[PDB]
Structure formats: C-alpha cells, structure tokens
Design a binder for this molecule. Structure first.
Ligand SMILES: CCCCCCCCCCCCCCCCCC(=O)OC[C@H](COP(=O)([O-])OCC(O)COP(=O)([O-])OC[C@@H](COC(=O)CCCCCCCCCCCCCCCCC)OC(=O)CCCCCCCCCCCCCCCCC)OC(=O)CCCCCCCCCCCCCCCCC
Ligand code: BCL
Ligand code: BCL
Ligand code: BCL
Ligand SMILES: CC[C@H]1c2cc3[nH]c4c(c3C)C(=O)[C@H](C(=O)OC)c4c3nc(cc4[nH]c(cc(n2)[C@@H]1C)c(C(C)=O)c4C)[C@@H](C)[C@@H]3CCC(=O)OC/C=C(\C)CCC[C@H](C)CCC[C@H](C)CCCC(C)C
Ligand SMILES: CC[C@H]1c2cc3[nH]c4c(c3C)C(=O)[C@H](C(=O)OC)c4c3nc(cc4[nH]c(cc(n2)[C@@H]1C)c(C(C)=O)c4C)[C@@H](C)[C@@H]3CCC(=O)OC/C=C(\C)CCC[C@H](C)CCC[C@H](C)CCCC(C)C
Ligand SMILES: COC1=C(OC)C(=O)C(C/C=C(\C)CC/C=C(\C)CC/C=C(\C)CC/C=C(\C)CC/C=C(\C)CC/C=C(\C)CC/C=C(\C)CC/C=C(\C)CC/C=C(\C)CCC=C(C)C)=C(C)C1=O
Ligand SMILES: COC(C)(C)C/C=C/C(C)=C/C=C/C(C)=C/C=C/C(C)=C/C=C\C=C(C)\C=C\C=C(/C)CC/C=C(\C)CCC=C(C)C
Ligand SMILES: CCCCCCCCCCCC[N+](C)(C)[O-]
Ligand SMILES: CCCCCCCCCCCC[N+](C)(C)[O-]
Ligand SMILES: CCCCCCCCCCCC[N+](C)(C)[O-]
Ligand SMILES: CCCCCCCCCCCC[N+](C)(C)[O-]
Ligand SMILES: CCCCCCCCCCCC[N+](C)(C)[O-]
Ligand SMILES: CCCCCCCCCCCC[N+](C)(C)[O-]
Ligand SMILES: [Fe+3]
Lengths: 307, 281, 260
C-alpha cells in the first residue's frame, strides 16, 4: 500500500510559533496553548495564541450569556433536576413571544421575554464576532474575504431571527432555541408555505450545498493528489506555478474539458459556499412576506411564463 | 488546442485496458478505453430516456420522468413502458459513472498523481447505488428507488421522508447534515483565507501561509494548517455522503417506524424514565 | 382584514429569481475568465497560438507584489516553458501522445515533468528559508511517530539504496517535507515525504528502484533547496511510478507466485 497523506507518519515540533506581528497589538495576544499530538496527526499540533482584546471579550461574554440564558431556562423546565435535565435535554425549548405580543418587548419573561433577552445577547455576540473577522484581517494587512463570506452566513441568520419576524410583524415568527424544537420549526415552516421544495431559492441553496461538498471533495482530493509536488503550498504556487498546479489543472482539463488555476479555484470555492446562505436567506425572506405558498406560486411562475 | 504548459505531460502510458488503442485526446478530453465506455453508456442512457419521454408523451424537461417498476414487480424485470426503461437506464448510469471513475484513474496514472479524486467520486457513486440498488434490494422491490425526473425525484424525497414522520429525527441524517453544513463553512473559510492572503490590502505584498496560520490563531486560537484544511475538506464532504448513504440504508430496513419514536430509547433509560417534571414527565 | 400583495407582488420573487440567474451568468463569466490567468492563450502542439481560443476572452492583467524583494507577478502574461521538452509527435494529426526522445526520467517529461520555477528557496514570513534540514532548524525534533533518521531506504526492486540522514522540515508550518538519503557514494538526495513509507525497520520507496536513486536531481547548496530544485526532485520521483514499472512489476511478481 502506498502512503496516502491522510495522516502524517512523522510529526515534528519546534519552538512555539508566536505568529506574524504586522500591525497586531501584541499586548492582546495570549501565550501559546498546549501542543496536541493527537491533532498533529491530521493538522497542526499547536494550540494558541489567541487574540483577546475588547471586542473579543465583549463577543465571548455576550455569547456565553446567550448560552446561559437558554441553559438556565432549560434547568427551570427540568424542575432543577439534573436527571430530568439530561433525559429531556433535546426536548427543552426557549420559545419566542406568542403572536399577540407582535414586535413589542412587553411579553413576560416566561412567555417570550427571556427569548428576547437571549436573542439580544446572540445579536451582540455574532455582530461583534463579525467585527473581529474584519479587524483581525486588517491588523495583518489581509483582504477582507473572511468577513465578506461570514456576512453571507449572517444574512440567513438575520433573516430567520430578525428581518423576517420584523417584516411579518411579530417575534412569534422567529426560531426557538432547542435541539428538537428548531427542527420542528423547520418542518413546520415548509408545511405552512406549501412545501419549500417549490421555492426556487431553496432548490438553488441546495444545489450550492451539494455543489459545495462536490467542490471540496474535488479540491481536497486534488491537492492531496498533488501534495507529492508540494501542491498544498498554494500561495507560492499562485506566485510561481509549479508542476503541482499544472498536473492538477490537467487532471480536470482531461476529465471534464476545462480547469481552474491555483488562485481561481479558491474563488469558485468562496462563491459556491457563500451562495448557499445568500440564495437561502432570500428564499426564506420571501416566504410569508410576498409568497404564502410556493406550490401555488410555482403554478403561476414556472408553468405560466413558459409562454 | 493545449494549455501552454500542457504538451510535456501528453506522453503515452497509464492505460488500464487496451494498451495504446484508446490512448489519445479529443480536444482537451482524454479518451482511453473508459472514455469510450462512458460515451457508450451515457449515449445509450440518454437515448432510452428520450424513448421513455416518447412513451410518456412529453418532451418537456420539467415533465419527463422515468419510473422504476411498481412494487408488484418486486425485484423482477418489468415491461419497458412500465419500469423496464428505468432498469436499463439505471444500469447505463451505473456503467457511465463507474467508467468515469476508472477513466479518472487512467488520467491519474498518466499524470503521476495520487488516486484521491476517483476514490472520492466513488463515494458519490455509492450513495447513488444505495438509493437505486442497495436499499431497494434489501426492501425487496425496485419500486422503492427514486424516479428520474427533475421534479418527480423531489416528490419522491418528500414522500419517502414523510413515511417516517419528520425525517429530521433520523440520527444518521442529523450527522450527515452536520457534515454538510460544516463542509460549506470550511469551504467558505478556506476560499476566503487563501484569497485574503493572495489579495491583501491595496499595495501590500502577498501574505504568506505564516499569516494564514496567524489569522486563524488570532481569530479562534487554532489553525489546522494548509495540509490539514484539504484533508479536512475531503473528510467532511466524504463523511457527509457516507452518513447520507447510512441514513437511508437503515431506513425501511432495520428501522421502519416513525423516526421521532426512536429517541424514546434515551428518555426510557431506567434511572430517569419515571422521574416526574420536564417534558417527558 | 388587511393585505396588499395579491395584485402584483408575487411578481417580486419572479423579479428576484430572474435577477439571480442574470447575476449567476455574470458570476460564472467572471470566475471562468479569472481562471484563465495561467496557461492561456491555448496553443497547437507545436507551440503556436491555436485558432480556437473558446468564447471567453483573457481577463485584464493583475499584479501580485511578492515579499522580500522578489518582485512582482503579472498574469495573464507571456507564457513559455523556458526549458527544452524532449518529446516528439507519434501521429500525423493532433490529439495523440508525444513519445519521449530520450530517457523521460532524465529529460523531465510525462509524469517525470518539472516546471522552470524560480531557482530561489521559498521563504517564510520573516524572510528566512521555509525549508531547512532539521539539524539546522533550531529547536526542531521528531515529536511523534517513528523517527526515520538512521533507517535503511529500500527501492521497489527490494534493494537498499541508502540511509536516511535527516528530515527536511518546513519551519513555519512545523512539518516534515523531505527525507535526506545518503547514497553508496556518500552524496545525498532528497525524497518527498509523500512518496516514502516509514516502517519499523526501513523506509520503503515504491516509486524508484534502487538503481534510480543516483539519478535523483541534486541540490546545489547542501542546506537549502530552491523551488526549481524541488520541482525537479518531486517530478523525477513521481515519474518512477510509470517509468520504473519494469523494475517493480518484475520483482513484485517473482516475489509472489510459486505454488503451481
Ligand atoms: C440580498 C442578499 C444580502 C447580501 C448579504 C451578503 C453579501 C456578501 C457577498 C459575498 C461576497 C464574497 C466575495 C469576496 C470578494 O471577492 O470581494 C472582496 C471585496 C474587497 O476585497 P478585500 O478582501 O477588502 O481586499 C482584497 C483585494 O484588494 C481585492 O480582492 P478580490 O480580488 O478578491 O476582489 C476584487 C473584486 C472587486 O470588489 C468588489 O466590489 C466585490 C463585489 C461582490 C458583490 C455581489 C453579491 C450580489 C448577491 C446576489 C444578488 C442576486 C439578485 C437577487 O472582484 C469581485 O469580487 C467581483 C465579483 C463578481 C460579480 C459578477 C457579477 C455578475 C452581475 C452581472 C450580470 C451581467 C451580465 C449577465 C448576463 O469586497 C467588496 O469590496 C464588497 C464590499 C463593499 C462594502 C460596501 C459598504 C459601503 C456602504
Ligand atoms: C441527493 C439526495 C436526493 C436528491 C434530492 C434533491 C433535492 C432536495 C434537490 C435536488 C436538486 C437537484 N438534483 Mg437531486 N437528488 C438525488 C439524486 C440526484 C441525482 C443522481 C443521484 O443521479 C442527480 C443527477 C440529481 C440532480 C438534481 C439537479 C436537477 C438539481 C441540482 C443538483 C445539484 O446542483 O447538485 C450539485 C452538483 C453540481 C452543482 C454539479 C452540477 C450537476 C447538475 C446541474 C446536473 C444536472 C443533471 C440533470 C439535469 C440530469 C440529466 C442528465 C442527462 C439526462 C444526461 N439529483 C437524491 C434522490 N436534489 C434540487 C432541485 O432544484 O431540483 C429541482 C433540489 O432542491
Ligand atoms: C421538512 C423540512 C423542509 C425544509 C425546510 C427548510 C427551511 C425552513 C430552511 C431550509 C434551508 C435549507 N435547506 Mg431545506 N428543507 C427541506 C428539505 C431539504 C433537503 C432534502 C430534502 O434533501 C435538503 C438537502 C435541504 C437543504 C437546505 C439547505 C440548502 C438550506 C440551509 C443552508 C444552510 O447552510 O443553513 C445553515 C446555516 C445557517 C443557519 C447560518 C448560521 C449563521 C451563523 C450566524 C450561526 C451563529 C452560531 C453561533 C451564534 C452559535 C455557535 C456556537 C459555536 C460552537 C461557537 N433541505 C424540507 C422540504 N430548509 C434554510 C434555507 O435557507 O432555506 C431556503 C431554511 O431556512
Ligand atoms: C420532507 C423531506 C425530508 C428529508 C428526507 C430525505 C430523504 C428521503 C433523503 C434525504 C437525503 C438527504 N437529506 Mg434530508 N430530509 C429533510 C430535510 C433535510 C434538510 C433540512 C435543512 O431540512 C437537510 C439539510 C437535508 C439533508 C440531507 C442530506 C444528508 C441527504 C442528501 C445529500 C446526499 O444524499 O447526497 C448524496 C449524493 C448523491 C446521491 C449524488 C450522486 C450522483 C453521482 C454518482 C453522479 C450524477 C452525475 C450525472 C447524472 C451528471 C450529468 C452530467 C452533467 C455534465 C453535469 N435533509 C426533510 C425532513 N432526506 C437523501 C440521502 O441521504 O440519500 C442517500 C435521501 O434519500
Ligand atoms: C456561508 C456558508 C456557511 C458559513 C460561513 C461562515 N461561518 C462563519 C464564518 C464563515 C465564513 C466566519 O468567519 C465565522 C468564524 O469565525 O468561523 C471560524 C463563522 C462562524 N460560524 C459559526 C457557526 C455556524 N455557522 C453555520 C454554517 C455556515 N457558516 C454556512 C454553511 C452553522 C450552521 C450550519 O447552523 C453554524 C452553527 C461559528 C463557529 C462562527 C461564528 C462565531 C460567533 O458568531 O460567535 C459568537 C458567540 C461566541 C463567541 C460564543 C458562543 C457560546 C459558546 C457556547 C461558548 C464557547 C466559548 C468557550 C469559553 C471556549 C471553550 C474552549 C476552552 C476549553 C478553552
Ligand atoms: C462524495 C462527495 C460529493 C461528490 C464528489 C465528486 N463528484 C464527482 C467527483 C467527485 C470527487 C468527480 O471526480 C466527478 C467529476 O468529474 O466532477 C466534475 C463527479 C461528478 N459529480 C457529478 C454530479 C453530482 N455530484 C453530486 C454530489 C457529490 N459528488 C457528493 C456530494 C451530485 C448531487 C449532490 O446531486 C450531482 C448531481 C458530475 C458533475 C460528475 C460526474 C460526471 C459523470 O459521471 O459523467 C459520466 C456520465 C454522464 C456524462 C451522463 C450519464 C447519463 C446517464 C447514463 C443517464 C442519466 C441517469 C440519471 C440517474 C438521471 C438523473 C435525473 C435527475 C433529475 C435525478
Ligand atoms: C487546485 O487544482 C484544481 C484545479 O486546477 C488548478 C481545477 C479543479 C477543478 C474545479 C473547477 C474547474 C471549478 C469548477 C468546477 C465545478 C463547479 C464542479 C462542477 C463541474 C461541472 C458541472 C462540469 C461538469 C462537466 C463534465 C462532467 C464533463 C462534461 C462532459 C462532456 C460534455 C464530454 C465528456 C466526454 C465523454 C462522454 C467521455 C470522454 C470520451 C470522449 C471525448 C469520446 C480543482 C478542484 C482543483 O483543485
Ligand atoms: C450545564 O448547564 C449549564 C446551564 C451550565 C449550561 C447548559 C446550557 C444549555 C443546555 C444550552 C442550550 C443551547 C441550545 C440547545 C441552543 C440551540 C440553538 C439553536 C438550535 C438556534 C437555532 C436558530 C437560531 C436563530 C435563527 C436565531 C436568530 C437570532 C437573531 C437573528 C437575533 C435577533 C435579535 C432579537 C430578536 C432581539 C432584538 C433586540 C434588538 C433591538 C437588536
Ligand atoms: C475551533 C476553536 C478551538 C478553540 C482553541 C482554544 C485555544 C486557546 C489557547 C489559549 C490559552 C493559552 N494559555 C494557556 C497560555 O493561556
Ligand atoms: C459557483 C457557481 C456554480 C453554479 C452552479 C449552478 C447549479 C444550478 C442548479 C439548478 C437549480 C434549478 N432550480 C430548480 C433550483 O431552479
Ligand atoms: C450546471 C452545469 C451543467 C453542465 C454544463 C456542462 C459544462 C461542461 C464544460 C464544457 C467542456 C469544456 N469545453 C472546452 C469542451 O468546452
Ligand atoms: C430525466 C430528466 C430529464 C432530462 C431533461 C434534460 C435536462 C435539461 C435541463 C433543463 C433545462 C430547462 N430549461 C432551461 C430549458 O428550461
Ligand atoms: C471541526 C470538524 C470536526 C467534525 C465535526 C463535525 C460535526 C459533526 C458531529 C457529528 C459527529 C458524529 N460522529 C462522526 C462522531 O459519529
Ligand atoms: C457550474 C459549472 C459551470 C462551469 C462551466 C463554464 C466554463 C466551461 C467552459 C470553459 C472553456 C474552456 N476553454 C475553451 C476556455 O478552454
Ligand atoms: Fe486550497
């Protein structure tokens, strides 16, 4: 059997890597974490350092508060009983205000108010985390592609929890915090809008979700296949094309008639992934606000403009 | 026409069948024995689909739909207009996909690269076969397979899913989904990271993999590294599909009731089954 | 009893999807032309511009600023191999293979190919050589797995070709990249890590028979390797899979099969 480069055969370690400085405030970086030999079979062995800073602390605090607001409500539903907590863990749910409260913050803590609080903390955690993806790239002199890609995930999240509820006129439209209950919410959303698979933006979102597994399987396999020529050193292959980048391009040219470059494959990548949630957010934003029933819509805009 | 760097790679050799008989290209496409086999299978398949369209009485691509034999046929043959075309088309599809993977293998051997790509593709083919072959065989009828139609195959997923209640409750489905979502996340981050390094702020020099590691350590306290990320993308996408095939092969065979009820096993553990309070007491 | 949508706002959604397909056609055009920054214009087999370039035009050039005074890269730009290609036509028309005119391993063609990359080492973010023999990498040591240093190295003919004398490591990524193997004459070669199997008693190299080790391209300085030298080394080693097949399939067939 030939070696396949799925796991490393030999690990090496050197002095802890404190990373590039550039314009980073080094006062806000932790020390390095431990080294994990386990992780080192597959990826890097080193943990940390991590960048703390004020936004970081804010984001973590806010995120933990979201998590604890849900978890505290769960304990309450468990009657403070640890065994009931674990038994029914997936069944508890922190639900939004009932329709009657509309968009007001007037609902009682136990009947929506607590959901609003948890949501508020989630809003701050996510947006401040977004700031952090921008700021960490900026400090290093890098492009802002991560922040732009993250914004696409944020779009579906905002649509689900904030924009669609506001446009529908009530917090009751939003998603509950629970394992099984968010799943029931999803099933129900589709039933009530006449079957989401008639929503063209849902079918697109799924083409991109599958395409995104198709594409990462293609790319990850290609890079490993040419790692014997240093193919995973992608930045240098971009600056100075090597036999790795040529054999990768020609595998695909010979297979399917066209190919990418070492840089441009990463653009197919970024867009295949971001379009999942871009088209997704649109498809659900339209659901209920402008289209009540996708089956009915499809009977009028799919068979009727075939004219 | 050739890429500018292409000629030096177009040497003889690497074929698995036929020696040099099919060792050539058509424009950019390599042929090989398996290029001929793919062409044959794909052509026959498409012709039979066109014939099924005629028997169905439509040429609209949004209406054409080829169905497997009704359940009464079990695992036997069926008349062509009644499931037989589906069966032949399925054999053609399978021949075409497997030929495609083996043509990829010939291309790997000519290029002196690893076999990771057709290995990965073979996962997709195994998911396809789970649905049209492995699962119907285990359940005792071709009629449990999906039909070949753009919208009809979606009716099949809806109908199949709803047979077991909210299919969300299938635990192998939950895992498959987590791998799909996690794969898309990682593909976004990978694309974004390489691009953000290769295309830095205006007038700055290209960043290095040192900066890519630094960015991820700053951000979340860990960077998997440039080899690791491609290992990961491959693992996440193959795992997603492995758990997809698993989630279906167990459905209608070892588990055939409402998936939500499967979870009672956890709720009903002796040491807490009877404690009151919570959702299930 | 309030709702102002029925008369023509399911139009919106129709508008949205129509817009999306237009956007997507534009995106695919952008992506495909981005991916024509290397290898284009297409060429005939004799290196002249092909008549049919396809429906996509070359993108406007972009320039990468390289670190450490390495200059810039502008693409698309003039393409040339910048090396002799020792292959000849085997047919009178386009689309057939090109036969090596010499020894394809020595000539660097087919799966033994290399690219005329810059004859300088890749550098890390601090401007130091990315890859170094571990003996010269301060603080670096094997941290897990069998340490290959000192093991005999076996080729696909099952003969010993030399002994591992060091590991070349990627300093910023903390990974093993090559093994340095000392040959019978006392000189060394580099072997890509992806092309060796570290075993308890040996390192096995399926790609090369033992007699082909001396032909591995040598590096000009013993403590660094340039991007050009890595391409030549990796291309040659991978080329053995096709071109040493006579010396592999002869052995791993006389090794098994004995019963009848
Ligand atoms: C509603 C949905 C809600 C939307 C939510 C979220 C959306 C997030 C979008 C995700 C984008 C990720 C892509 C990242 C990227 O490449 O751009 C980086 C780019 C900057 O790069 P950088 O990382 O900072 O620096 C690195 C380099 O300097 C430069 O780096 P670089 O080389 O990578 O970037 C150069 C860049 C140039 O910079 C850009 O401006 C990026 C442009 C992308 C926006 C489009 C998303 C539209 C969504 C679908 C709508 C469907 C309709 C319904 O080139 C492009 O990216 C252009 C893309 C291709 C679009 C092709 C258009 C097809 C329409 C055409 C149809 C025509 C004919 C068809 C027949 O991002 C932007 O400038 C856009 C942000 C602007 C902020 C505006 C706020 C001011 C108020
Ligand atoms: C995977 C689990 C289910 C599945 C459930 C879903 C659901 C749910 C949806 C789809 C949708 C898609 N599915 Mg399906 N479908 C399955 C089986 C398949 C198979 C197969 C096994 O052979 C095929 C070819 C398709 C293909 C199709 C496309 C029509 C559409 C977009 C897919 C995509 O971009 O993927 C990603 C891959 C790429 C981006 C590469 C591009 C390949 C595509 C475009 C191939 C089209 C081929 C098609 C027209 C077949 C004609 C073949 C010719 C006769 C030769 N499905 C099984 C039964 N599929 C979506 C849709 O919009 O349907 C109306 C959708 O919402
Ligand atoms: C019965 C169920 C219904 C159905 C109803 C729904 C509904 C409802 C929705 C989808 C949506 C989607 N459906 Mg559907 N779906 C159906 C059947 C299918 C089938 C199938 C049958 O094979 C498939 C493949 C899909 C696939 C898809 C995806 C393409 C899409 C979600 C994209 C995504 O990445 O979301 C995952 C990504 C996110 C949710 C973004 C996350 C954002 C960030 C900000 C998260 C923050 C996390 C942080 C605060 C906490 C983390 C803690 C950490 C540990 C630190 N559906 C049927 C018809 N589907 C979604 C969509 O877009 O629809 C158009 C959606 O709203
Ligand atoms: C109401 C419907 C039910 C549903 C019931 C089902 C059912 C039923 C199924 C799934 C399956 C899937 N569901 Mg579900 N599920 C639902 C809700 C969802 C939601 C959601 C957010 O709500 C999500 C994310 C998912 C996601 C999942 C995935 C795990 C899985 C589909 C991917 C896959 O199998 O790929 C695997 C990939 C393939 C099969 C593609 C193989 C194609 C290859 C070999 C070649 C084709 C190429 C050729 C024809 C190209 C033409 C040439 C051109 C030039 C391009 N489901 C709801 C609750 N789900 C399916 C599954 O697991 O299947 C195994 C499945 O059968
Ligand atoms: C655009 C397509 C896909 C996508 C993209 C995407 N997501 C993104 C990014 C992008 C590019 C970001 O850069 C950002 C990121 O930083 O990723 C690493 C992110 C992200 N996507 C995430 C989740 C996520 N994304 C989703 C998926 C998707 N994201 C889409 C498929 C999903 C799904 C599918 O439901 C999930 C759940 C996060 C991992 C991260 C956003 C992080 C965030 O906003 O954090 C706010 C909250 C906190 C800071 C803390 C939360 C509370 C925790 C329970 C506590 C953990 C802290 C603890 C103290 C540490 C424990 C360790 C100790 C032992 C030391
Ligand atoms: C395993 C991880 C993911 C994956 C990986 C993967 N797919 C792969 C590969 C890999 C690595 C390739 O090497 C190979 C490729 O060349 O990619 C460009 C491929 C490929 N994946 C493809 C499609 C595809 N992959 C899918 C998904 C996935 N592929 C997984 C999620 C899907 C989904 C999710 O629905 C589709 C649609 C092709 C683009 C390509 C294989 C092309 C091929 O086999 O061509 C030979 C055959 C033909 C040209 C046509 C055959 C025609 C048939 C005889 C008749 C059609 C019958 C069909 C069943 C009807 C379907 C009707 C539908 C409406 C249901
Ligand atoms: C770093 O490296 C990398 C590259 O290069 C540097 C490259 C790629 C490849 C990736 C791309 C080019 C990006 C775009 C790709 C996708 C979005 C994946 C989806 C692709 C498609 C939908 C195209 C599908 C095309 C196919 C299957 C071929 C079409 C088939 C024909 C019309 C003819 C095929 C011929 C036959 C029948 C058999 C051959 C025999 C004869 C010609 C006779 C990757 C992954 C990579 O990582
Ligand atoms: C061991 O016990 C302890 C207590 C210590 C810890 C355990 C706690 C546990 C068990 C926590 C459980 C967490 C779970 C199960 C959470 C599950 C979350 C899920 C599945 C969420 C799914 C969807 C979320 C969405 C779409 C939410 C979107 C939210 C927004 C978009 C924010 C919108 C903001 C609003 C409405 C507030 C308005 C405020 C203003 C004015 C900005
Ligand atoms: C995928 C997210 C993983 C979380 C990795 C958290 C690592 C943080 C290490 C910082 C701790 C260093 N230390 C011990 C000096 O404080
Ligand atoms: C990075 C861009 C790649 C583009 C891939 C496009 C796949 C299109 C799939 C067709 C979906 C049809 N439908 C029914 C949803 O409207
Ligand atoms: C949604 C995608 C549907 C598949 C479209 C087929 C594209 C294949 C690429 C064509 C082959 C390239 N070339 C040079 C021969 O034209
Ligand atoms: C067996 C499935 C039916 C195959 C039909 C051929 C696929 C063509 C793709 C549909 C094109 C629809 N469009 C854009 C013309 O409206
Ligand atoms: C950070 C990538 C690690 C993979 C984790 C992805 C989430 C899937 C969680 C389900 C795990 C189920 N499994 C494979 C342990 O059985
Ligand atoms: C979603 C898949 C869409 C990809 C197909 C579009 C590009 C294929 C055409 C490339 C043409 C190759 N050529 C002639 C320029 O060398
Ligand atoms: Fe990559």
């Amino acid at each position: 059997a030939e070696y396949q480069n799925i796991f490393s055969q030999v690990q090496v370690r050197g002095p802890a890597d404190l990373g590039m400085t550039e314009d980073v405030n080094l006062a806000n970086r932790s020390g390095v974490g431990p080294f994990s030999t386990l992780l080192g079979w597959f990826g890097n062995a080193q943990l940390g350092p991590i960048y703390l800073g004020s936004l970081g602390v804010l984001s973590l605090f806010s995120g933990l508060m979201w998590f604890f607001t849900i978890g505290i409500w769960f304990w309450y539903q468990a009657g403070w009983n640890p065994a009931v907590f674990l038994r029914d863990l997936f069944f508890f749910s922190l639900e939004p205000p009932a329709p009657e409260y509309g968009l007001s913050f007037a609902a009682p803590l136990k009947e929506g108010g607590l959901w609003l609080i948890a949501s508020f903390f989630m809003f701050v955690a996510v947006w401040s985390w977004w700031g952090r993806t921008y700021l960490r790239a900026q400090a290093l002199g890098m492009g802002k592609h991560t922040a732009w890609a993250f914004l696409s995930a944020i779009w579906l999240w905002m649509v689900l929890g904030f924009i669609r509820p506001i446009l529908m006129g009530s917090w009751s439209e939003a998603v509950p915090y629970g394992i099984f209950s968010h799943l029931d919410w999803t099933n129900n959303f589709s039933l009530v809008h006449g079957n989401l698979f008639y929503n063209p933006f849902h079918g697109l979102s799924i083409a991109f979700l599958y395409g995104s597994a198709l594409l990462f399987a293609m790319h990850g396999a290609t890079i490993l296949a040419v790692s014997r020529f240093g193919g995973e050193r992608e930045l240098e292959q971009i600056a100075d094309r090597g036999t790795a980048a040529e054999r990768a391009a020609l595998f695909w040219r010979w297979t399917m008639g066209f190919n990418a470059t070492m840089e441009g494959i990463h653009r197919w990548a970024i867009w295949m992934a971001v379009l999942v949630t871009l088209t997704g957010g649109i498809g659900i934003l339209l659901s209920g606000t402008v289209v009540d029933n996708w089956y009915v819509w499809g009977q009028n805009h799919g068979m009727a403009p075939l004219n | 026409a050739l890429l500018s760097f292409e000629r030096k790679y177009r040497v003889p050799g690497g074929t698995l069948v036929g020696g040099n008989l099919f060792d050539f290209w058509v424009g950019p496409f390599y042929v090989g024995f398996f290029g001929v086999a793919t062409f044959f299978f794909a052509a026959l398949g498409i012709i039979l689909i066109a014939w099924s369209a005629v028997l169905q009485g439509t040429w609209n691509p949004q209406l054409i739909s080829v169905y497997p034999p009704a359940l009464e046929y079990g695992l036997g043959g069926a008349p062509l207009a009644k499931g037989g075309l589906w069966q032949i088309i399925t054999i053609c599809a399978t021949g075409a996909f497997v030929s495609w993977a083996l043509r990829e293998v010939e291309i790997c051997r000519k290029l002196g690269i690893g076999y990771h790509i057709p290995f990965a593709f073979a996962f997709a083919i195994l998911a396809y076969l789970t649905l049209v072959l492995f699962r119907p065989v285990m359940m005792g009828a071709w009629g449990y397979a999906f039909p070949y139609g753009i919208w009809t195959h979606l009716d099949w997923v809806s109908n199949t899913g709803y047979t077991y209640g909210n299919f969300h409750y299938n635990p192998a489905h939950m895992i498959a989904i987590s791998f799909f979502f996690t794969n898309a996340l990682a593909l976004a981050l990978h694309g974004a990271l390489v691009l953000s390094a290769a295309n830095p702020e205006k007038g700055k020099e290209m960043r290095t993999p040192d900066h890519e590691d630094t960015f991820f350590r700053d951000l979340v306290g860990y960077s998997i590294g440039t080899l690791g990320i491609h290992r990961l993308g491959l693992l996440l996408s193959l795992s997603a599909v492995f758990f997809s095939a698993l989630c279906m092969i167990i459905t209608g065979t070892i588990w055939f009731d409402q998936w939500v009820d499967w979870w009672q096993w956890w709720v009903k553990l002796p040491w807490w089954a009877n404690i009151p309070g919570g959702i299930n007491g | 009893m309030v709702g102002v949508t029925a008369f023509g706002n399911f139009d919106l959604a129709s508008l949205a999807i129509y817009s999306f397909w237009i956007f997507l056609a534009g995106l695919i055009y952008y992506l495909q032309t981005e991916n024509m920054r290397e290898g284009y214009p297409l060429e005939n087999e004799d290196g002249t511009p092909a008549a049919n370039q396809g429906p996509f035009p070359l993108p406007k050039p972009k320039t990468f600023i390289l670190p450490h005074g390495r200059g810039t890269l502008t693409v698309p730009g003039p393409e040339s191999e910048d090396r002799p290609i020792a292959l000849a036509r085997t047919a009178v028309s386009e689309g057939f293979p090109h036969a090596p005119t010499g020894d394809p391993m020595k000539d660097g063609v087919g799966p033994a190919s290399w690219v005329a990359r810059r004859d300088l080492p890749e550098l890390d973010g601090h401007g130091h050589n990315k890859i170094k023999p571990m003996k010269a990498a301060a603080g670096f040591h094997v941290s897990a797995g069998k340490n290959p240093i000192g093991l005999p190295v076996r080729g696909c003919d099952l003969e010993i070709a030399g002994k591992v004398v060091d590991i070349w490591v990627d300093i910023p990524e903390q990974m093993a990249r090559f093994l340095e193997v000392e040959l019978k004459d006392g000189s060394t070669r580099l072997l890509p890590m992806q092309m060796v199997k570290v075993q308890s008693n040996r390192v096995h190299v399926n790609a090369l028979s033992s007699d082909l080790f001396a032909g591995i391209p040598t590096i000009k300085s013993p403590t660094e390797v340039t991007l050009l030298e890595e391409d030549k080394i990796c291309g040659y080693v991978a080329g053995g899979l096709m071109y040493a097949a006579p010396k592999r399939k002869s052995v791993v067939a006389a090794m098994l099969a004995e019963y009848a």
